[PDB]
Design an enzyme around this catalytic site. Structure first.
Site, mmCIF file in Angstrom:
data_model
loop_
_atom_site.group_PDB
_atom_site.id
_atom_site.type_symbol
_atom_site.label_atom_id
_atom_site.label_comp_id
_atom_site.label_asym_id
_atom_site.label_seq_id
_atom_site.Cartn_x
_atom_site.Cartn_y
_atom_site.Cartn_z
ATOM 1 N N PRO C 1 0.792 -1.228 0.000
ATOM 2 C CA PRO C 1 0.000 0.000 0.000
ATOM 3 C C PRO C 1 0.832 1.290 0.000
ATOM 4 C CG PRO C 1 0.048 -1.001 2.182
ATOM 5 C CD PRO C 1 0.511 -2.032 1.202
ATOM 6 N N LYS C 32 1.972 -7.709 1.829
ATOM 7 C CA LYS C 32 2.105 -7.211 0.462
ATOM 8 C C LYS C 32 3.582 -7.154 0.095
ATOM 9 C CE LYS C 32 -2.352 -5.641 0.165
ATOM 10 N NZ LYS C 32 -3.355 -5.714 -0.918
ATOM 11 N N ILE C 64 -5.002 -1.490 -2.933
ATOM 12 C CA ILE C 64 -5.824 -1.948 -4.037
ATOM 13 C C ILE C 64 -6.652 -3.147 -3.543
ATOM 14 C CG2 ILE C 64 -5.822 -3.007 -6.327
ATOM 15 C CD1 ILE C 64 -3.296 -1.142 -6.889
ATOM 16 N N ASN C 97 -6.662 7.669 7.514
ATOM 17 C CA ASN C 97 -7.746 7.387 6.587
ATOM 18 C C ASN C 97 -7.380 6.194 5.716
ATOM 19 O OD1 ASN C 97 -8.200 10.173 7.488
ATOM 20 N ND2 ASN C 97 -9.761 10.274 5.878
HETATM 21 O O1 LIG Z 1 -16.537 15.007 11.977
HETATM 22 C C1 LIG Z 1 -16.360 13.772 11.992
HETATM 23 O O2 LIG Z 1 -17.270 12.947 11.756
HETATM 24 C C2 LIG Z 1 -14.992 13.242 12.275
HETATM 25 C C3 LIG Z 1 -14.192 12.967 11.172
HETATM 26 C C4 LIG Z 1 -12.920 12.455 11.350
HETATM 27 C C5 LIG Z 1 -12.058 12.166 10.172
HETATM 28 C C6 LIG Z 1 -10.677 12.225 10.158
HETATM 29 N N1 LIG Z 1 -10.291 11.901 8.919
HETATM 30 N N2 LIG Z 1 -11.396 11.632 8.116
HETATM 31 C C7 LIG Z 1 -12.481 11.804 8.901
HETATM 32 C C8 LIG Z 1 -12.459 12.229 12.645
HETATM 33 C C9 LIG Z 1 -13.264 12.504 13.754
HETATM 34 C C10 LIG Z 1 -14.552 13.006 13.576
HETATM 35 O O3 LIG Z 1 -15.358 13.316 14.660
HETATM 36 C C11 LIG Z 1 -15.956 12.455 15.565
HETATM 37 C C12 LIG Z 1 -16.218 12.937 16.854
HETATM 38 C C13 LIG Z 1 -16.819 12.120 17.809
HETATM 39 C C14 LIG Z 1 -17.176 10.816 17.474
HETATM 40 C C15 LIG Z 1 -16.933 10.329 16.187
HETATM 41 C C16 LIG Z 1 -16.326 11.145 15.230
HETATM 42 O O1 LIG Z 2 -0.848 -3.068 -1.473
HETATM 43 C C1 LIG Z 2 -1.594 -2.748 -2.419
HETATM 44 O O2 LIG Z 2 -2.777 -3.148 -2.492
HETATM 45 C C2 LIG Z 2 -1.074 -1.827 -3.484
HETATM 46 C C3 LIG Z 2 -1.503 -0.505 -3.488
HETATM 47 C C4 LIG Z 2 -1.067 0.388 -4.467
HETATM 48 C C5 LIG Z 2 -1.543 1.805 -4.430
HETATM 49 C C6 LIG Z 2 -0.839 2.876 -4.930
HETATM 50 N N1 LIG Z 2 -1.577 3.959 -4.708
HETATM 51 N N2 LIG Z 2 -2.762 3.644 -4.046
HETATM 52 C C7 LIG Z 2 -2.730 2.305 -3.875
HETATM 53 C C8 LIG Z 2 -0.166 -0.059 -5.441
HETATM 54 C C9 LIG Z 2 0.272 -1.384 -5.438
HETATM 55 C C10 LIG Z 2 -0.180 -2.267 -4.454
HETATM 56 O O3 LIG Z 2 0.231 -3.575 -4.456
HETATM 57 C C11 LIG Z 2 0.014 -4.425 -5.522
HETATM 58 C C12 LIG Z 2 0.811 -5.566 -5.622
HETATM 59 C C13 LIG Z 2 0.660 -6.456 -6.676
HETATM 60 C C14 LIG Z 2 -0.303 -6.214 -7.637
HETATM 61 C C15 LIG Z 2 -1.115 -5.086 -7.551
HETATM 62 C C16 LIG Z 2 -0.956 -4.193 -6.502
#
Ligand SMILES: O=C(O)c1cc(-c2cn[nH]c2)ccc1Oc1ccccc1
Ligand SMILES: O=C(O)c1cc(-c2cn[nH]c2)ccc1Oc1ccccc1
Lengths: 114, 114, 114
Positions: C1, C32, C64, C97
């Site tokens: 990843p 991976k 992926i 995320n």
């Molecule tokens: O506003 C949100 O929903 C919220 C969103 C995120 C987030 C971070 N990266 N992507 C999303 C983290 C916490 C959040 O707040 C929370 C506060 C209390 C309980 C659960 C989520």
């Molecule tokens: O770990 C993964 O899933 C994986 C993820 C990505 C990726 C790049 N940007 N966003 C995602 C690329 C290759 C990966 O690995 C691979 C290994 C073999 C074949 C295909 C993907």
């Protein structure tokens, strides 16, 4: 929510207090507790909008739920307004990408949400 | 369309006018109005690919539609080529994440594209 | 990843060989192939978590296919554990995320996956 701003506007022009104001305003707007709001500003960036190096911003709002048509318009208005007011970036050179994150796909404090 | 490049390639290696070049090539490749094309280049990054420090890049291209199988193949060939010629990064050390944004989730000019 | 860390922890507080450890650990956790593991760390960022600017991190992990809550909880603990131990970042100030990318929307080496 998580809010990220990338911009060609320099460090110096980022007012002190601006991160706090984004946190306050994003709590007021989203209906989310401010303790979990994260904000991130990246000034001095090599970026362009329409080809031109005039002030611009590439932004991101990630939220777990509460994302759609009407809400994303009110957040766009609020944040464009804030970027124009505070960093002197014109609304038509701002992009804000909105993401609805599913709870299990957001890590925090050695685990994930709910 | 929005295209972002992060790389460990230093600031000095990015040639003058590269952002305009990316903007011309992306405008052709997507058929989109040039005024909506945003580009962002972040050099000097602390990055690794395969665990190695060698020149690499992590990129993303966000667009409202015009994202799919063949188009992405073609964008990859176009964009890896530009990164090979201009930044001297081997295509096999480049990722480009493509995203098909829904119109309601893209804010711009105090509103969204819905 | 692909793993990306953005943090307000300074350049100097990041130990030497942290990108290889992240690559090592990501390979053994996910199974991976390490050759395709991409890591990116961005220190000295202007950010706040819960209104406050104590050391924090906003991260992303793109794969992926195949994402689920069991794996994401394990990755969260692993990754939060590394950020506590090496970057002095408390786990209650770390977002990660997770994203399930379709093969066709990851560009690599002049084409895309599958
Ligand atoms: O506003 C949100 O929903 C919220 C969103 C995120 C987030 C971070 N990266 N992507 C999303 C983290 C916490 C959040 O707040 C929370 C506060 C209390 C309980 C659960 C989520
Ligand atoms: O770990 C993964 O899933 C994986 C993820 C990505 C990726 C790049 N940007 N966003 C995602 C690329 C290759 C990966 O690995 C691979 C290994 C073999 C074949 C295909 C993907």
């Amino acid at each position: 929510p998580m809010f990220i701003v990338n911009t060609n506007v320099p460090r110096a022009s980022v007012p002190d207090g601006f991160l706090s104001e984004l946190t306050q305003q994003l709590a007021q707007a989203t209906g989310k507790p401010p303790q979990y709001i994260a904000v991130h500003v990246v000034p001095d960036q090599l970026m362009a909008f329409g080809g031109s190096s005039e002030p611009c911003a590439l932004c991101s709002l990630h939220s777990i739920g509460k994302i759609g048509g009407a809400q994303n318009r009110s957040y766009s208005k609020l944040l464009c307004g804030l970027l124009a007011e505070r960093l002197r970036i014109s609304p038509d050179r701002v992009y804000i990408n909105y993401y609805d994150m599913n709870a299990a796909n957001v890590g925090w404090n050695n685990s994930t949400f709910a």
